[PDB]
């Protein structure tokens, strides 16, 4: 039968920004994790609520693939029960999370001489993000009593900022492509088993 398209998620040319993170719905396929078992290029491989083993003998209903690019120091924030800019304003995971987090260094693909300014993240927000919530609005953030009315100035800021990737930075500041897989099991019959 059909095999799940993990290669398209992992081996894609373009990755979305963290604030406008991408999500893909994988269903009606057999999932083969032998592609992930031995790769020698992954810097992070942590699975929450299920062992890395036993994945080929487990059946699930839906599998979601979330992909974005962040810096190395912010990879630790992609985990249940974490706080920070990325966790509170860009991407949130539930406390009771069943899934895996995979990250690898993409310094040779997403960094160019002079600075790559195509990846953005949100600085200001009124309230913390709920789990699996996506925000893409670009309205001017107001930090004072005076209304902004679209005239940027003091106490009226644009809520997005650029990463500015350079090839000479440290591994903490180098870009990392992060793929987050979320497995949900419901009363519906299993569709992704992968024996």
């Amino acid at each position: 039968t059909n095999l799940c398209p993990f290669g398209e998620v992992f081996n894609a040319t373009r990755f979305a920004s963290v604030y406008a993170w991408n999500r893909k719905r994988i269903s009606n396929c057999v999932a083969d994790y032998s592609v992930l078992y031995n790769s020698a290029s992954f810097s992070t491989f942590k699975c929450y609520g299920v062992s890395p083993t036993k994945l080929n003998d487990l059946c699930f209903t839906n599998v979601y693939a979330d992909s974005f690019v962040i810096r190395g120091d912010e990879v630790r924030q992609i985990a249940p029960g974490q706080t920070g800019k990325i966790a509170d304003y860009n991407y949130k995971l539930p406390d009771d999370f069943t899934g895996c987090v995979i990250a690898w260094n993409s310094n040779n693909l997403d960094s160019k001489v002079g600075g790559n300014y195509n990846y953005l993240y949100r600085l200001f927000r009124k309230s913390n993000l709920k789990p699996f919530e996506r925000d893409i609005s670009t309205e001017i953030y107001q930090a004072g009593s005076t209304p902004c009315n679209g005239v940027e100035g003091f106490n009226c800021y644009f809520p997005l900022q650029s990463y500015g990737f350079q090839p000479t930075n440290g591994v903490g500041y180098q870009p990392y492509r992060v793929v987050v897989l979320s497995f949900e099991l419901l009363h519906a019959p299993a569709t992704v088993c992968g024996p």
Partner: antibody
Amino acid sequence: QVQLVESGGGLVQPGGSLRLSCAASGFTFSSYDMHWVRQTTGKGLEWVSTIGTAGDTYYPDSVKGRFTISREDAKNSLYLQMNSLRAGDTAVYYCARGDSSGYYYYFDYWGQGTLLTVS
Amino acid sequence: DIQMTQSPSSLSAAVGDRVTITCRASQSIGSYLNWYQQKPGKAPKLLIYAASSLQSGVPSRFSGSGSGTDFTLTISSLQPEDFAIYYCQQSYVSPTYTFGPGTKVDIK
């Protein structure tokens, strides 16, 4: 019954190499995962290696790049190759069998252990 | 990594008494916990998994309860062969499993 016997540990100079073994009995060695756990009196129990049924190997950040775990189902022997030993690797090593009841994981059976000293 | 802590460090109880061992997690881990007993100069043994389930062969005197960041192991009557160091382990984050520090039960 189920038993696990370790052998291949002793005194060794820093920076050297050593290879342990752990024979098994009473169960299908190819149908179960195998782990190595150390115990130091100053740090307690700690996990150092894990090998799966499908050839997957998992390592902690402490010993990654230095320890290699191998499995030979025909001989029912599980090995652990150590390289670039330091003074911080002196502990009693156990071989454990990993089993799951649903989504929950645990270590069911352990071996007697094998003392390794770095001098 | 998720850090597990136990209290008290040392416990002293007599035969037939009641004891309580508490294991606390630095993060909510739900019902992912295991308990191990280690008699001196021997190998650790498995008692409880999923924080409330009894492994086959373990005496019925043991029970476990709790969820989130608070867990408890209770022995109804302390038999003469139940003096050992007890460890709690979390099984929520993989493959980097972490163990507890250890609690010792003696005889007064």
